[PDB]
């Protein structure tokens, strides 16, 4: 299979996920 298939899947999984988690964390820290 594509050697970049796994990398593309991983980055697709990760980047929006870390974005959303960062937004939620900097929301919840605030009152």
């Amino acid at each position: 299979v594509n050697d970049l298939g796994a990398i593309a899947t991983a980055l697709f999984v990760f980047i929006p996920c870390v974005f959303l988690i960062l937004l939620y964390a900097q929301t919840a820290s605030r009152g």
């Binding site: 299979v1 298939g5 796994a6 899947t9 991983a10 999984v13």
Partner: peptide, 28 residues
Amino acid sequence: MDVIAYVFILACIIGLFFFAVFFREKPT
């Protein structure tokens, strides 16, 4: 190794279900 990618995404989905069910902020 694709199997590992599929299984990891699936396990993350199940964990998300667990947290979304038992740890949602209380509606009010």
